[PDB]
Amino acid sequence: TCPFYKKIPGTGFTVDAFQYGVVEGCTAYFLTHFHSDHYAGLSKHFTFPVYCSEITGNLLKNKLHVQEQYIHPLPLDTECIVNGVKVVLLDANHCPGAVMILFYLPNGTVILHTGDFRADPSMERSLLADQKVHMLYLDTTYCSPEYTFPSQQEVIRFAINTAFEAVTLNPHALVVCGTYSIGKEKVFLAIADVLGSKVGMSQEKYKTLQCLNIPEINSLITTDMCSSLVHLLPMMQINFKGLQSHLKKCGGKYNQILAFRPTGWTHSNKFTRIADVIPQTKGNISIYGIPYSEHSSYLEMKRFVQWLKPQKIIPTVNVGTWKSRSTMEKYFREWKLEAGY
Ligand SMILES: CO/N=C(\C(=O)N[C@@H]1C(=O)N2C(C(=O)O)=C(COC(C)=O)CS[C@H]12)c1csc(N)n1
């Protein structure tokens, strides 16, 4: 049974609702981005129109084998008509191909569905600013003040400087980055760039990255793993045992691994007050937990919502418990009272 927050009222549209069979009344299925929790259910046997970004369409065609006749890629920042309703797709600042959707309802209402997003002040000076938005379907992943983390730029600076120093001190070191989906490509691409290396990876991951329209990416990635100083591994292998086993590969041409894992999103006086990143180390293997996020921090989310001033907010994340629903509604009310909308 499709939850109500996945249906757009006054339309026959659903958003990220592919695991519920045939949704009654749905004439178009929007997919905000290619993450498993959102595309769950899509396959080569889906026979309804899917509306998405071009990059998401590339992944649907090449990774899930969705038939081309049902993939409807839409350009960003462009007014499009879908089944009699004007829509606009905007970059969500999440993972490649991820979009927010503006719906211009026939009754004059405007709805913004953020998909998954990392709110940024740049969104306030975009075409989002050119009309009132009445209802907001909000990515509330980190809707609590303890969710603080640096800008992606600060985190990438840390990772680049850490990896460059380690490999320049020890040219026999290897950098490993963990991955389980698309997104956070900047981490391993930036490290490989500063090291003059390509990123070695599995054929399956290589295929995935080939779908993302990343400029000059043939110059940055390879399936020849031992020829590179940066390797991508499945996230489940980013542990001392998994990295020890990997070090035994490639003829043992490396004697050190620095691994990067995205983690560490909670920081407050209650829990992990110090945000400074220090690796977990065992012998010649170090694992850096870096707070690289592709969701809004609490402050980023708050700023965006107080700028947008929506009349109604419908969370799309963390609404499975009464505690989380209640806390989120308290924050929305706080934000509304502070900003006066
Ligand atoms: C900075 O690292 N943050 C991590 C992570 O990758 N941690 C690591 C890992 O695996 N380790 C193991 C391990 O491999 O078991 C041990 C235990 O070994 C010792 C010290 O003797 C200690 S923590 C380290 C993390 C955050 S969320 C998650 N799933 N992992």
Ligand SMILES: CO/N=C(\C(=O)N[C@@H]1C(=O)N2C(C(=O)O)=C(COC(C)=O)CS[C@H]12)c1csc(N)n1
């Ligand atoms: C308003 O609450 N509506 C719910 C509900 O309990 N919602 C939830 C929420 O948020 N969840 C997330 C979440 O937090 O992300 C996922 C995760 O989903 C995936 C597949 O990633 C699964 S549903 C649970 C509901 C669920 S089924 C139904 N008819 N109503």
Ligand code: NI
């Ligand atoms: Ni996502």
